Amino acid sequence: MAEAHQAVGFRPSLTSDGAEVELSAPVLQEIYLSGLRSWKRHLSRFWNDF
């Protein structure tokens, strides 16, 4: 009685979200990585001078 299931089966795997979050992490990660590559050009002055 303490433990019970709504249904024997489970909704479609497609409907379920495999990813832990879907805020936009994948997009954010790509933008951050791309920005870092570009950042080096802007950081060149500081980078050259220890």
Swiss-Prot record:
Expressed predominantly in brain and testis. Expressed in motor neurons. Residues 1-50 are cytoplasmic. It is found in: Cell projection, Dendrite; Cell projection, Axon; Endoplasmic reticulum membrane. CPT1 enzymes are comprised of an N-terminal regulatory domain and a C-terminal catalytic domain that are separated by two transmembrane helices. In CPT1A, the regulatory domain, termed N, adopts a malonyl-CoA inhibitory and non-inhibitory state, Nalpha and Nbeta, respectively, which differ in their association with the catalytic domain. Peripherally associated with AMPAR complex. AMPAR complex consists of an inner core made of 4 pore-forming GluA/GRIA proteins (GRIA1, GRIA2, GRIA3 and GRIA4) and 4 major auxiliary subunits arranged in a twofold symmetry. One of the two pairs of distinct binding sites is occupied either by CNIH2, CNIH3 or CACNG2, CACNG3. The other harbors CACNG2, CACNG3, CACNG4, CACNG8 or GSG1L. This inner core of AMPAR complex is complemented by outer core constituents binding directly to the GluA/GRIA proteins at sites distinct from the interaction sites of the inner core constituents. Belongs to the carnitine/choline acetyltransferase family. It is linked to Spastic paraplegia 73, autosomal dominant: A form of spastic paraplegia, a neurodegenerative disorder characterized by a slow, gradual, progressive weakness and spasticity of the lower limbs. Rate of progression and the severity of symptoms are quite variable. Initial symptoms may include difficulty with balance, weakness and stiffness in the legs, muscle spasms, and dragging the toes when walking. In some forms of the disorder, bladder symptoms (such as incontinence) may appear, or the weakness and stiffness may spread to other parts of the body. Palmitoyl thioesterase specifically expressed in the endoplasmic reticulum of neurons. Modulates the trafficking of the glutamate receptor, AMPAR, to plasma membrane through depalmitoylation of GRIA1. Also regulates AMPR trafficking through the regulation of SACM1L phosphatidylinositol-3-phosphatase activity by interaction in a malonyl-CoA dependent manner. Binds malonyl-CoA and couples malonyl-CoA to ceramide levels, necessary for proper spine maturation and contributing to systemic energy homeostasis and appetite control. This is Palmitoyl thioesterase CPT1C. It comes from Homo sapiens (Human). The chain holds residues 1 to 50 of 803 of the full protein.
